[PDB]
């Protein structure tokens, strides 16, 4: 058993011990553990997935170096890896399609078991590790959540975007997720027009820096999108905020058949106008995290120079805890 310095969540406002790996398990030395809006919802005790219990080391957005292995892990000590965060039960019909992210008995380091705000972290199986060929664990850490979630959301969006020669895609909420959502869209789709929506001028400026073509307050978005699309509307809106008001307003900006990809869940509920949605065949599609292939893909885009990290190192854009 290995000693490790961590940050513990004990009540909703130092040095721990970590078991040695057996079977397929792997022990890693954390290089980076990203800080999510999800950590703050757990921190504030407004979100608790199955198996959650106190205390717990938070941090579900993790990269580092392999230091010890069980006899069945089949991985190389010294390799840098990013940790896929949603460890499915492997048995259910979702896991049997690689949809570990929507397994209802998933184990999540930092959300339901000990995570990355710690020197060392146990990983249940090497099957959850994606190799970093050249990207640093610190820069790679956000890919384990913000990156993968952005990719999974974009993949749901693609058929809606590909229907048009010059589609407008709305990205609502410019924070950690928008870093990856905007850059991934521009990396893949050469003829897309991205519109960034936020209430903060600072955030709108940042969306432009990330690669948004236009930015807007929500109230001004219709007049802009009308002009950009000759009244057609947006192909997709990726909602990184997810409140009653964001989805309602986004839905109305969509062209017929268009979709909101719901990633954010800051509100208790989401809402849509019944007439606009039913009459024009509009859609809302929930998106939680992504597949192992999605994580592989964002690592590859990053290592090939197509995505740039915007990270803020924080000693124990996106913030990253190092160690």
Q: Is the dihedral of CA 133, 139, 145, 146 positive or negative?
A: negative
Q: Pick from a second copy, Zn ion, none: which does 38 bind, CB < 5 to 8 A by kind?
A: Zn ion
Of 16-24, 100-108, 134-142, 167-175, the window that binds Zn ion (rule: CB under 5 A) is 100-108
Tell whether residue 165 is a contact of a second copy (CB under 8 A).
yes
Bridge partners of residue 286, in order along the sequence: 262
Q: Exposed (0-12), middle (13-18) or buried (19+): which is 69, by Cβ within 10 Å?
A: buried
Interacting residue with a second copy among 59, 147, 175, 242 (CB under 8 A): 242
3-state SS string over 217-266?
CHHHHHHHHHHHHCCCCEEEEEECCCCHHHHHHHHHHEEEEEEEEECCCC
- CA-only gyration radius of the chain, Å: 20
Cα maximum dimension of the chain: 64
CB of 172: closest distance to a second copy in angstroms?
14
CB of 93: closest distance to a second copy in angstroms?
5
Tell whether residue 38 is a contact of Zn ion (CB under 5 A).
yes
Nearer to a second copy, 16 or 92 (CB): 92
Of 27-35, 53-61, 286-294, 310-318, the window that binds a second copy (rule: CB under 8 A) is 286-294
Distance CA 163, CA 157 (A): 11
Contact positions with a second copy (CB under 8 A) in 198-237: 232
Tell whether residue 191 is a contact of a second copy (CB under 8 A).
yes
Interacting residue with Zn ion among 9, 26, 33, 36 (CB under 5 A): 36
Q: Is the peptide bond before 124 cis (omega within 30 degrees of 0)?
A: no
Tell whether residue 60 is a contact of a second copy (CB under 8 A).
no
- CA neighbor of 178 nearest in space, from 83, 318, 283: 318
User: Residues within the annotated binding site for Zn(2+)?
Assistant: 36, 60, 89, 92, 95, 103, 145
Contact positions with Zn ion (CB under 5 A) in 101-130: 103
Q: Give contact residues for Zn ion (rule: CB under 5 A).
A: 36, 38, 88-89, 92, 95, 103, 145
């Amino acid at each position: 058993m290995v000693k490790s310095k961590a940050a513990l969540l004990k009540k909703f406002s130092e040095d721990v011990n970590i078991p040695e790996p057996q079977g397929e398990e792997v022990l890693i030395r954390i290089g980076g553990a990203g800080v999510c809006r999800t950590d703050l919802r757990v921190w504030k005790g407004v979100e608790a997935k199955q198996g959650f219990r106190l205390p717990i080391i938070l941090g579900h957005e993790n990269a580092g170096t392999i230091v010890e292995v069980g006899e069945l892990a089949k991985v190389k000590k010294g390799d840098n890896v990013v940790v896929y965060a949603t460890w499915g039960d492997l048995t259910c019909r979702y896991c049997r399609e690689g949809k570990f992210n929507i397994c209802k008995n998933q184990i999540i380091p930092g959300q339901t078991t000990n995570g990355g705000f710690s020197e060392y972290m146990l990983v249940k199986s090497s099957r959850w590790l994606v190799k970093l060929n050249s990207l640093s664990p610190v820069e790679a850490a956000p890919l384990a959540d913000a990156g993968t979630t952005s990719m999974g959301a974009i993949r749901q969006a693609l058929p809606f975007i590909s229907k048009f020669a010059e589609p407008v895609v709305i990205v609502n909420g410019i924070g950690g997720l928008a870093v990856y959502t905007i850059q991934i869209l521009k990396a893949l789709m050469k003829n897309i027009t991205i519109v960034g929506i936020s209430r903060s001028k600072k955030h709108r400026d940042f969306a432009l820096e990330l690669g948004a073509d236009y930015v807007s307050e929500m109230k001004d978005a219709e007049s802009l999108i009308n002009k950009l699309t000759d009244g057609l509307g947006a192909s997709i809106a990726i909602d990184l905020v997810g409140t009653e008001e964001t989805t309602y307003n986004l839905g109305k900006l969509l062209a017929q058949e268009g979709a909101i990809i719901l990633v954010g869940m800051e509100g208790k509920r989401v809402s849509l106008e019944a007439f606009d949605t039913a009459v024009w065949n509009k859609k809302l599609l929930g998106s939680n995290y992504g597949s192992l292939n999605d994580l592989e893909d964002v690592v590859r885009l990053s290592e090939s120079g197509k995505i740039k990290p915007y990270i803020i190192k924080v000693p124990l854009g996106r913030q990253v805890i190092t160690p």
